[PDB]
Design a protein around this motif. Structure first.
Motif, PDB file in Angstrom:
ATOM      1  N   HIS A 255      19.447 -11.831  52.650  1.00  0.00           N
ATOM      2  CA  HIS A 255      18.115 -11.765  52.568  1.00  0.00           C
ATOM      3  C   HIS A 255      17.653 -12.269  51.451  1.00  0.00           C
ATOM      4  O   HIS A 255      15.999 -12.556  51.884  1.00  0.00           O
ATOM      5  CB  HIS A 255      17.857  -9.699  51.917  1.00  0.00           C
ATOM      6  CG  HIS A 255      18.497  -9.053  52.452  1.00  0.00           C
ATOM      7  ND1 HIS A 255      19.750  -8.307  52.269  1.00  0.00           N
ATOM      8  CD2 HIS A 255      19.012  -8.689  54.251  1.00  0.00           C
ATOM      9  CE1 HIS A 255      20.733  -7.752  52.970  1.00  0.00           C
ATOM     10  NE2 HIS A 255      19.983  -8.033  54.082  1.00  0.00           N
ATOM     11  N   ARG A 256      18.060 -12.925  50.018  1.00  0.00           N
ATOM     12  CA  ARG A 256      17.162 -13.933  49.415  1.00  0.00           C
ATOM     13  C   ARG A 256      17.190 -15.113  50.005  1.00  0.00           C
ATOM     14  O   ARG A 256      15.674 -15.549  50.388  1.00  0.00           O
ATOM     15  CB  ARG A 256      18.355 -14.278  48.108  1.00  0.00           C
ATOM     16  CG  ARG A 256      17.288 -15.248  47.831  1.00  0.00           C
ATOM     17  CD  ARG A 256      16.494 -15.066  46.954  1.00  0.00           C
ATOM     18  NE  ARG A 256      16.200 -15.041  45.384  1.00  0.00           N
ATOM     19  CZ  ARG A 256      14.679 -16.082  44.880  1.00  0.00           C
ATOM     20  NH1 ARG A 256      13.905 -15.504  45.682  1.00  0.00           N
ATOM     21  NH2 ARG A 256      14.930 -16.883  43.598  1.00  0.00           N
TER      22      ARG A 256
ATOM     23  N   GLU B 208      18.561  -5.534  38.921  1.00  0.00           N
ATOM     24  CA  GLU B 208      18.920  -7.367  38.722  1.00  0.00           C
ATOM     25  C   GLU B 208      18.788  -7.272  40.396  1.00  0.00           C
ATOM     26  O   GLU B 208      18.101  -8.637  40.634  1.00  0.00           O
ATOM     27  CB  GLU B 208      20.714  -7.247  39.402  1.00  0.00           C
ATOM     28  CG  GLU B 208      21.440  -6.551  39.942  1.00  0.00           C
ATOM     29  CD  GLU B 208      21.911  -5.415  39.450  1.00  0.00           C
ATOM     30  OE1 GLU B 208      21.282  -4.427  39.031  1.00  0.00           O
ATOM     31  OE2 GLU B 208      22.646  -5.040  40.104  1.00  0.00           O
ATOM     32  N   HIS B 209      17.910  -7.225  41.293  1.00  0.00           N
ATOM     33  CA  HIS B 209      17.024  -6.987  42.430  1.00  0.00           C
ATOM     34  C   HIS B 209      15.345  -7.177  42.159  1.00  0.00           C
ATOM     35  O   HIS B 209      14.817  -8.385  42.769  1.00  0.00           O
ATOM     36  CB  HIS B 209      17.626  -6.389  44.146  1.00  0.00           C
ATOM     37  CG  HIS B 209      18.848  -6.897  44.464  1.00  0.00           C
ATOM     38  ND1 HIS B 209      20.076  -6.607  43.887  1.00  0.00           N
ATOM     39  CD2 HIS B 209      19.517  -8.066  45.105  1.00  0.00           C
ATOM     40  CE1 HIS B 209      21.181  -6.470  44.160  1.00  0.00           C
ATOM     41  NE2 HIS B 209      20.758  -7.698  45.284  1.00  0.00           N
TER      42      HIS B 209
ATOM     43  N   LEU C 271      16.430 -23.791  45.255  1.00  0.00           N
ATOM     44  CA  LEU C 271      15.337 -23.833  44.154  1.00  0.00           C
ATOM     45  C   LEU C 271      16.413 -24.976  43.829  1.00  0.00           C
ATOM     46  O   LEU C 271      17.412 -24.696  43.929  1.00  0.00           O
ATOM     47  CB  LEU C 271      15.383 -22.338  43.806  1.00  0.00           C
ATOM     48  CG  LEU C 271      14.558 -21.348  44.712  1.00  0.00           C
ATOM     49  CD1 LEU C 271      15.204 -20.062  43.773  1.00  0.00           C
ATOM     50  CD2 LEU C 271      13.511 -21.489  44.256  1.00  0.00           C
TER      51      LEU C 271
ATOM     52  N   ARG D  53      18.638  -4.843  49.080  1.00  0.00           N
ATOM     53  CA  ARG D  53      18.555  -5.200  50.079  1.00  0.00           C
ATOM     54  C   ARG D  53      17.325  -5.889  50.229  1.00  0.00           C
ATOM     55  O   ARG D  53      17.032  -6.913  50.957  1.00  0.00           O
ATOM     56  CB  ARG D  53      19.033  -4.603  51.236  1.00  0.00           C
ATOM     57  CG  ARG D  53      19.825  -3.682  52.385  1.00  0.00           C
ATOM     58  CD  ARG D  53      19.778  -2.629  53.104  1.00  0.00           C
ATOM     59  NE  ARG D  53      21.252  -2.857  54.139  1.00  0.00           N
ATOM     60  CZ  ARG D  53      21.146  -2.680  55.094  1.00  0.00           C
ATOM     61  NH1 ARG D  53      20.777  -0.673  54.711  1.00  0.00           N
ATOM     62  NH2 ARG D  53      22.290  -2.194  55.569  1.00  0.00           N
ATOM     63  N   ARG D  54      16.704  -5.898  49.041  1.00  0.00           N
ATOM     64  CA  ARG D  54      15.411  -7.084  48.534  1.00  0.00           C
ATOM     65  C   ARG D  54      14.444  -6.418  49.379  1.00  0.00           C
ATOM     66  O   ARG D  54      13.508  -7.075  49.534  1.00  0.00           O
ATOM     67  CB  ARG D  54      15.572  -8.279  48.600  1.00  0.00           C
ATOM     68  CG  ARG D  54      16.762  -8.596  47.786  1.00  0.00           C
ATOM     69  CD  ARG D  54      16.710 -10.190  47.832  1.00  0.00           C
ATOM     70  NE  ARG D  54      18.407 -10.176  47.116  1.00  0.00           N
ATOM     71  CZ  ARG D  54      18.444 -11.246  46.751  1.00  0.00           C
ATOM     72  NH1 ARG D  54      17.625 -12.087  45.276  1.00  0.00           N
ATOM     73  NH2 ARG D  54      19.803 -11.246  45.436  1.00  0.00           N
TER      74      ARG D  54
ATOM     75  N   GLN E 146      14.082 -14.374  52.716  1.00  0.00           N
ATOM     76  CA  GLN E 146      12.991 -14.151  51.493  1.00  0.00           C
ATOM     77  C   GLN E 146      12.801 -15.767  51.385  1.00  0.00           C
ATOM     78  O   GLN E 146      11.094 -16.347  51.402  1.00  0.00           O
ATOM     79  CB  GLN E 146      13.267 -13.176  50.278  1.00  0.00           C
ATOM     80  CG  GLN E 146      13.109 -12.080  51.475  1.00  0.00           C
ATOM     81  CD  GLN E 146      13.440 -10.502  50.595  1.00  0.00           C
ATOM     82  OE1 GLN E 146      12.861 -11.521  49.286  1.00  0.00           O
ATOM     83  NE2 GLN E 146      13.568  -9.675  50.871  1.00  0.00           N
TER      84      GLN E 146
ATOM     85  N   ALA F 187      21.012 -11.150  40.440  1.00  0.00           N
ATOM     86  CA  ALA F 187      21.750 -10.158  41.266  1.00  0.00           C
ATOM     87  C   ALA F 187      22.162 -11.590  41.673  1.00  0.00           C
ATOM     88  O   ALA F 187      21.829 -13.220  42.212  1.00  0.00           O
ATOM     89  CB  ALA F 187      20.634  -9.233  42.180  1.00  0.00           C
ATOM     90  N   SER F 188      23.254 -12.008  42.316  1.00  0.00           N
ATOM     91  CA  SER F 188      24.094 -11.973  43.587  1.00  0.00           C
ATOM     92  C   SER F 188      23.556 -12.962  44.629  1.00  0.00           C
ATOM     93  O   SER F 188      22.346 -12.482  45.751  1.00  0.00           O
ATOM     94  CB  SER F 188      25.886 -12.385  43.816  1.00  0.00           C
ATOM     95  OG  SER F 188      25.112 -10.700  43.997  1.00  0.00           O
ATOM     96  N   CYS F 189      22.664 -14.079  45.124  1.00  0.00           N
ATOM     97  CA  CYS F 189      21.761 -14.133  45.890  1.00  0.00           C
ATOM     98  C   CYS F 189      22.867 -13.396  47.193  1.00  0.00           C
ATOM     99  O   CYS F 189      24.329 -13.913  47.259  1.00  0.00           O
ATOM    100  CB  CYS F 189      21.813 -16.121  46.515  1.00  0.00           C
ATOM    101  SG  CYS F 189      23.472 -16.768  46.680  1.00  0.00           S
ATOM    102  N   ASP F 190      22.212 -13.859  48.383  1.00  0.00           N
ATOM    103  CA  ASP F 190      22.496 -12.559  49.761  1.00  0.00           C
ATOM    104  C   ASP F 190      21.608 -13.244  50.962  1.00  0.00           C
ATOM    105  O   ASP F 190      20.904 -14.153  50.561  1.00  0.00           O
ATOM    106  CB  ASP F 190      22.353 -10.931  49.164  1.00  0.00           C
ATOM    107  CG  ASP F 190      21.244 -11.028  48.907  1.00  0.00           C
ATOM    108  OD1 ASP F 190      20.347 -11.184  49.091  1.00  0.00           O
ATOM    109  OD2 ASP F 190      21.072  -9.710  47.795  1.00  0.00           O
TER     110      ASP F 190
END
Ligand code: CL
Ligand code: CL
Ligand code: CL
Ligand code: ZN
Ligand code: ZN
Lengths: 231, 231
Positions: free
Chosen positions: A127-128, B80-81, A210, B101-102, A131, A122-125
């Motif tokens: 929430h990523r 994908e998440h 990362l 939303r992870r 975390q 998934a594309s980063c967001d």
């Protein structure tokens, strides 16, 4: 904690992608080069038969890549449909890439790199980044998608999985995944032919916690050139 | 045909999934065994803390599995998440499965089989069957999703990638994917705990032109059973 429903179109923050377009309507001029700045996204309108070159100028940058049918953001380049159609996890030169209707949307014509890309992640967001221990807003590919479409007056109804150009996320025997630096080189390019009129979106991934944009973790820009339909 | 926009919610045909629900509101009686008929889909409401058994009664059947947040079909279990969160291509017991939303949406608690499931491949649809040479309408998991949600008065705004329970379509050396029969056995089950109030949807995949539901290519039913939330 969330106190509202999920909104595919709503950015969680802002950067210049909200307001800056490459060219009016995303219609790139012939014989011109354009740049998606580091950490940002931009939308590009293609006509059927045109071809878009995406250039990893500095050599280690990931481009999160999407394509939507012109006039319908509900039909898009779809990783989970691409895979069964090709019977492969990621595309190679010559491969026709399909939409969520399983019809051709783009063809991958050229790839000067070793051929490593990712279709799984998934594309980063926001929430990523939370975390990963980040405090405050962090630029992110999902917001860049939302903003880049918004800047052309378009609204996504879903966030598709990106095609992660140059991303090196190996899956090993057992199913585990690793986040590794890219194997692309300075100036490597990919070339995509449009099989339909489309709106392409590219986000220069800002991941800097990362090594996926290089060991130095210093996100960079990407250059693009649009070739007209052949005579 | 494709001069209309894609509609995530609109079925391309009909079967009894449009009409028939397992129980009123999809609210199963705890500890009762229900059956999702062969070739069909059903929706199941779960409260946070409840757990759901999905049972491969005949041993070779694939269940395409989705989960949506109660009150918000825009937030869903997202393959994908899931993958970057686990750093694994597919889940194993003990793994917390996340939404787009992870955040946790389900936990996979048990799997009696060897643990082969697919997270890579889109749900079958009318286009897939046409491309495999079928004439006319074929039951399909995408339509089953749409109908199952419709039968509860709900409408999806996107078709997420399913979690294809028991599907054996591995990525092999060099990047190709193979379509193999399942390695599950009669009576194998998985158990999921809901981490939010959710609507689960399961389609008994009707694929009968590939051996993914067994070499005999004879789609079967799946059983389910809900257990109540703990003290
Ligand atoms: Cl990421
Ligand atoms: Cl399929
Ligand atoms: Cl390899
Ligand atoms: Zn990113
Ligand atoms: Zn199916």
């Amino acid at each position: 904690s969330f106190d509202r429903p999920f909104e595919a179109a709503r950015p969680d923050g802002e950067n210049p992608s909200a307001h800056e377009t490459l060219a009016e309507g995303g219609r790139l001029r012939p014989e011109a080069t354009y740049t998606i700045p580091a950490r940002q996204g931009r939308a590009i309108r293609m006509a059927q038969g045109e071809a878009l070159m995406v250039i990893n100028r500095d050599g280690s940058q990931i481009g999160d890549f999407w394509a939507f049918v012109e006039g319908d953001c509900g039909e898009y380049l779809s990783m989970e449909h691409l895979r069964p159609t090709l019977r492969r996890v990621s595309p190679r030169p010559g491969d026709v890439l399909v939409s969520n209707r399983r019809r051709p949307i783009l063809t991958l014509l050229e790839d000067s790199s070793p051929g490593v890309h990712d279709t799984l992640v998934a594309s980063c967001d926001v929430h990523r980044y939370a975390q990963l221990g980040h405090e405050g807003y962090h630029d992110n590919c999902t917001d860049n998608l939302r903003m880049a479409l918004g800047a052309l007056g378009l609204r996504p109804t879903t966030v598709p999985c990106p095609l992660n150009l140059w991303m090196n996320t190996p899956v090993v025997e057992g199913g585990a995944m690793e986040w590794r630096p890219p194997v692309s080189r300075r100036g490597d390019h990919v070339l995509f032919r449009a099989e339909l009129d489309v709106v392409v979106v590219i986000s220069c991934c800002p991941m800097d916690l990362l090594p996926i944009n290089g060991e130095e973790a210093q996100p960079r820009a990407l250059d693009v050139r649009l070739r007209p339909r052949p005579a």
